[PDB]
Amino acid sequence: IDGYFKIYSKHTPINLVRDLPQGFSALEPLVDLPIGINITRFQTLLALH
Amino acid sequence: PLQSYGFQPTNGVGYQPYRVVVLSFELLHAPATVCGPKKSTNLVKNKCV
Numbered sequence: 001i002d003g004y005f006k007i008y009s010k011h012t013p014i015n016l017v018r019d020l021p022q023g024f025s026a027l028e029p030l031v032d033l034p035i036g037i038n039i040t041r042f043q044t045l046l047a048l049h
Numbered sequence: 050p051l052q053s054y055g056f057q058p059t060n061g062v063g064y065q066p067y068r069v070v071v072l073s074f075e076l077l078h079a080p081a082t083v084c085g086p087k088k089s090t091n092l093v094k095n096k097c098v
């Protein structure tokens with residue numbers, strides 16, 4: 001937004017490894033960076049096991 | 050292409066070295082990131098401020 005890359009986060013227990021926890025989330029901002037560069041694509045970066 | 054300056058302690062003032070620093074301010078339709086802190090005051094309670 002307006003040049004800022006923002007990251008919000010939260011942690012919730014998992015009943016199913018392959019699915020989501022139920023109930024409402026309410027994530028809070030941690031990172032807000034004034035870069036001025038657009039994102040059109042997202043790639044998850046994985047670590048190798 | 051390059052030629053050195055004879056910066057000697059015996060030169061008159063016009064030929065003495067001067068350190069030049071230019072602070073250029075870039076104001077774009079982008080987030081601002083270099084701000085003055087302005088001056089602070091102390092907190093006053095129970096008065097109109």
Ligand SMILES: *[C@@H]1O[C@H](CO)[C@@H](O)[C@H](O)[C@H]1NC(C)=O
Pocket residue numbers: 036037038
């Ligand atoms: C972001 O989009 C704007 C609007 O078209 C464009 O001027 C700018 O070059 C883009 N920046 C990047 C890093 O793609």
